[PDB]
Each structure stands twice: as C-alpha cells, then as structure tokens.
Amino acid sequence: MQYDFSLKDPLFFTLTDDDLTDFSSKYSAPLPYDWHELSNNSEWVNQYPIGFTTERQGWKVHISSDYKHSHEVLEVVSKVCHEFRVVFKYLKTEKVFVLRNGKNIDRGYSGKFITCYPNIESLEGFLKELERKLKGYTGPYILSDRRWREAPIYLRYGVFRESIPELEGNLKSDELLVSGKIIKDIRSPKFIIPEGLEIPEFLEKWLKDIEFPFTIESAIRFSNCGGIYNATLSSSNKKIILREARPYTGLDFSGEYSTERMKSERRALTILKDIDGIPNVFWYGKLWEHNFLGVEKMDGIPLNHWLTKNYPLYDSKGKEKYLYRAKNILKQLISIVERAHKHSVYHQDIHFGNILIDRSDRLSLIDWEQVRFDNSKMVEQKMAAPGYGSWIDDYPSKIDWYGVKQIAHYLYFPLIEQTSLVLGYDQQTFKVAHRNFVEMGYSDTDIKNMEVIINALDNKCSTFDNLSEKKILKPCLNNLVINSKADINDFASRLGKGLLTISDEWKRKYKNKRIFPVHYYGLKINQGIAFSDLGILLSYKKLIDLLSDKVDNSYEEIKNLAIQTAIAKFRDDSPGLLDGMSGTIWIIHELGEKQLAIDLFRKYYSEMLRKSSEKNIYSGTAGILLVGLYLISQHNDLSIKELIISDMNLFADNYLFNPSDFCKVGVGDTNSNDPYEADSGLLFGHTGIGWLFGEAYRYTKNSKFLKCLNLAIESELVAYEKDDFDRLQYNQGKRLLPYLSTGSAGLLLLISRNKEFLQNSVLNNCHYLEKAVSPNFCVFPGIANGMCGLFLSKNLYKSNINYVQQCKELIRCLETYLCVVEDGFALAGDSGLKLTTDISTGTAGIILTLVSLRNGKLELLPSVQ
C-alpha cells in the first residue's frame, strides 16, 4: 500500500494527515462581495464566484512564483481573476509553499502556487492580462506544463472538478474525454496533449511555436531540484557526475534555493581543490535556464553496502580482518573532515550514504549541498539523515564531528537510528559490540585500537543536557543478571510496566485515536495480528497470566472499547490473519470471548472466505482456515464444522492440482520490507500452507494433508539455497533473509513441530537451517523481521529445553535494543526511530516471545496440540 507517516512527533510515528501544527504565515487574497472562499483540503484554498461552476475539463492556468514575492503575486493574480471571473485556487500557508517547492516532492505535482480555471472563452483575455500584469515576477518552470510567453504562466489540459455535469456524466476525475473516448490524465513531468481534441486557434499558434558540452548516458536519481545524471564530458571523454538545479526549487525554511546551495557547493569544492577522497568540480555553467555542476565520479559502493558485504553478521570466518579495515576507513574519514575544517568548510550532512568505499578501501565524502563556511554561530542542521543529525543547535564545527562519531559507532555496531531517540544509546551498544567482538575471536589490539579512536571521537563532540520530550527514555547501562525465574519475572513485569506507561503517554498526547503506538507499516490499520491494539492487549493478558499478577485497573474497559471498535470497524475488504478480521476474531477468542468469537465467525464465515484474493497465511484464505481449525479443535460443537472440513479438502485438492498457482515459487526481485511486497517464508508463502496442513493433519487425520505438507516442503526448498559454508537462506533478489516472516526461521518451526509425522530426508535440513538462523548481530528486535523469531525458531520445539537457560541468552540478546522509561522497558521496532508497541515490530513481540517460551507453543499462529 501507500504510507504517509511523519517523523514530527519526538517519540512516535504519526501520519501526515494527523499533522495540523502550522505556525507559518497564511496566504490570503481579498474577497469581493459576490465571491466565496472555501477550503476542503489541507493544501489548497478555493475561490469561486457565487453560483458559478466551471467545466469538467479544459486548459487550466498554473502560476508559479518566488518565496519573497509570493504574497504580493497573490494580490496581482487575484486582482486579475476578479474581473475575468474565473475559479482560482492557491496554497494555504508558507509551509505548504515550501513543501510544494521543495526537494523530495514529485516533479509533476511541484511548483504550482496558483491554479486557475477559465472555461473556454475568458482564457484568451485572461492569459493576455496575466501576461501584461506579471512583469518582474519570476518562478519555477512546472514540468508537467508549458510556459505561455515569458511570465510564469503555465498551461495543461487536465481535469477541473470531480463530477458535477448534469447527473454524473459517467466519467471519473482521472480520465479525460476526447472525441467521446476515455483517455487517462497522466500526472508526470511531461507535457501530454491528448490526440484528437480541438485546439483553439491562438492555442494552435502557441503550440505550433515550439548540443550540450557533455554526453549523458543515464540518470541516477530525480528530485524537485532536478536530476543527478551520469554523464561524460565531451572535451575529455571522462565520466563525471552531473547535478542540475532548475531555478527557484529546493526551497527550505531558511529561505534558500537549490541554485544558492550549488554556488555554495562549487565554492566548497573549489576551496578543497586537492584532497584525496574529495570530488573536484570539472564543469559549471547554465544551459537554457538550468545550471549544471560536473563533479568527479568517485568510485565505490556506499557505506551500508560495504558494511553488508564486510560486517561479521554470522561468524569471523573470512571476515577475520574487519576491525583493522574499519579503523583505516574511520581514520580516512577523520583526516578528510579535519583537513576540511582547517579551510573553514563544514559538511553538515555526514551519514552512511555520503561515504563511498572502493574495493581497495579508499574513502570518498560526497553530497556537499548543505555546506556552511562561517563557524561563529549555533546553527541548525537543515536536512539530516535520522540517527546522524545533531540533537541541539550547535556550531558547524561540531555537527560534522557528531556525524563522524555516529559513523564510528556505525562501523563498530550497526545500530544508529536509535541514537536519535535515546540519548546515550551509542554507549549501550558499545558494550554489546565489545562482547560480540571478543566472542568471535578478534585480537585485543584491534578492538583496543578501534575503541581508542571511538572514545577520542566521543570527546570531540558537545556534551549537553537533554531537554527535549524524549529525555524520559534512558539507555540500559547495567546488564541484568538472570539466574532464576524471579529474575525473568522482574524483566516481564518491567516490560508490562513500560508498555502501559508508553500507551498512557500516547493516549495523553493523541486523544480520539488508537490506544497504542504502532510502526508505520501498520499505522492506518487496526486489525490483524501484526499491528493492531487488540494483539498488544492479548500479549499483555498473557504476560499477566505468566507471572500471575492482576489487571492494571482500567484494562477491562480498555479491552472492552477495543473489542467494540473492532466490531464497529469490521470490514470485508481484507480477510487476513495478520492484517484483517480472522486474527481479530482469534484475539477475541483468546481474550475470553469464545462464544462471541464462534458466533461472529459463523456469522461472517461464508462471505469472508468467498471474498478473498491471496493464498498465504497473512492475507489469504489459509488464515480463515486456520482460525476455523482452532475453533473446531477447541470446540467440537460447531454447526459450520462440515463446511470447514470440506473447504480444507477443496484447498488440499487445489494445492495438489495446480502447481505454482498459490504464490511465487522462485527467487523473486523485491528488496523491500513491506509485508505486501513479500511472497515467501512463514507468513507470505508455502510455509503458511504447510503450517495449515500440518495442523489439519493433527486434527482431522488424512493422507491428503500429509501430502500437502510434503508438497509445501518440496515447493519451499526450491528457493532455499546453500551459502558459502553451511547456511540455507532465501534470496529476495539482492539480499538474504533468515527472518521469521520471510525466511529460514519460519520453515524450521514446522519442520521441528511436525518432526514426528515428516520423513528423514527433510529432517536432514534441520541442521542446515539451524546455523543459518543463528547470527551474532540482528538488525531488528521484532518477532517477525528480527531477533525474537530467530531465537524462537532456534529454541522452540527442539526438546530438552530449559526455561532459565534460554531466557539467560534471550535477555542478554535483548539488552541491545532496550530503553528505560519509568521503572520499565520500552523498545523501538524495525526502524529504530520511534517507539512501537505492536507485535510484529515492537514490545508485544518480545512479550509473546517470553510467553511462547514459557508455554512451549506459539501465540503468533494457532499451534493446536
């Protein structure tokens, strides 16, 4: 799907639709007596005459402007529009103007300050009067449009309004009507004229009035400032990197454009003319109206890619000289931006994307767009990568050293995104990285030489007093000693206290909303066991029933209103287990509402199985079948039981009949972490089918279900491949994922669970998948895409398992990703940026990990004994 989360809250993820704090200056125009001004958006303000509407399509007029002359161009354009009575609209505030004329907005939606709608007849005089009165006013070229004559007046053929037009005109707001046909309106950085529409005569004259000193081969990245092109200079046949800045774009809140912090970049790269590891400006000049910068193409993959090839994720075998090379890379960075600070040049944006490493370990520092030149002041870092920007308003000389300190901690333990949330997290992971680097077998002199440089970079930064809203989060400096079940119960009670503390503070800040902060992959959902509040309430209940406490006073009312909200929002455009209503009804069954659960399940079973699209356990019919199997195994009085077993038999016959028609049987190409763009593992693939038909075999014994189990194993190990030593991991096209949702940790759970029924030839893979799921460093802490599923696969259904000895490893691994709030624990999900309480990424997955370790059976999926 599409997510519009914002990093505006200091502690939590929040959508931009819930962002309303606008202290910027409001744009306004005078309103005549026979005019009305109406807003029905968060960006635009519509002005229309009384009782006059426009057409549904036609030539719309776009007007762009500067930031300084934007309030006084609105007066001129509104004064023009108040004789030529046309419907025009403009941007709300100055912040909307900056975010529309910024950098990371789409090139087809950018630059539009004022949009006008003359019908067909006032357009000719309207364009002439706007051309006559907009002298001296300049603005960005809008890429989807075409400039009229010389003033910032821009035209396209587009859709004016939504329907109107007698009854409903049988048309939509995305498709135009040319000669009684359906042509879609493409909103792209291009001028699209649909073929066949009658151009007027003056517009026909306007449309009929339509060598570089380099050779551009391709493009690397595109933005509202303009592209970054991989070009080759014609005068030398030498490959460079191009970067353009179309005028009056890249607006920030300082008031600068991309044409100003490009003369700044040219001056910065001219001052640092001869430094090893620094790009050189080779060509700078304006072509038409776009100025171009030719910098030296520094070779090398970025720092995260070099780390992914070179960090000891699993063992020290082969990567036996990592710390010496990382020390050399860090010293190369320190030398480069300390020779840069002698020339009064400050980079102000140092993160893992701005360092490139060669195959011979040579460092290059790029992206000098945000350079400062005069120290002298406590300045604000404008646009910084999260985890690397400075916390306070400091000098330009210390912002680069903070960036170098975070690169130093990145090279020594790759968890940096939580240092922007918890102050002192770089010392929390310092001891963990020391323990990991003495556990692998590294030399003590290499660790000492790394740690001396890191500790010397720690003293080169600024020590401040935390005054922000995220100073309630403290690191875990003291490691807990786990020796008995009381020490495990203390940790579990601290998890339960921190969960309710963070929930109460979220409900304090955001009323009339969700009762729990959730990772941005599931912000605008409240169903299914990955991101819902009901799953967190279930995890809290099974945590209370683990250490035998009582409910936290208002917990019964919280779970009553959560269940009532789930009933009120019980849709049907889903049927999923971990994103929909089968997981919601299994939560309702597990919370203590079993009669209401079987009632509502038998109420919507037929429609909620018939209306479905996918086939996985996540968002396909397998989740419905597994909830029905749990309901008829726990309760043998279901009147809909025969329809459940017949649908399982039909699904089994379809699984034997159709090959590779359930999901993708292959490698794949998607390299993202979105759950809807993954098609493998326990949650998204044939392993969910095997989990369904290894429990259907347990309850309703058939040869067809064991045949489905072996077919699921034989289909799943096609994509699983042997690594360098002994590891079997799934390929997502460009990377390998041993996680519980997409890889080796989900398959081994049912090979170990169904080990008695299954044969020997694919219990032989239990050792090949065992050390492929035991690394030394795991990036995320969650149960699905992280360490708590890696631990659960390694330990659960493995026989002769001690609770205390397993928890002693678990808590020791869990004190890497933890933070302290009140007298409890909180944790950040699969970003590290903001606090999460959900199951698939946040604290409730750890709570369910402890519950599933105590009980011996999973709580993420039904595991009927």
């Binding site: 789409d106 090139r107 070229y141 890429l143 950085p189 291009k190 339509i210 570089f212 551009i216 391709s218 493009a219 690397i220 990245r221 595109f222 933005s223 303009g226 592209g227 092109y229 353009e244 072509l287 038409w288 109206e289 776009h290």
Partner: peptide
Amino acid sequence: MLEEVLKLQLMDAKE
C-alpha cells in the same frame, strides 16, 4: 534548449 533541457527529466532510473 528549453525542450532538450526539460527532456532530461524524462530519462530513466528516475526518482
């Protein structure tokens, strides 16, 4: 070269 210049935006490996 208005056009050419603007064509550059319609290259590949975009955004």
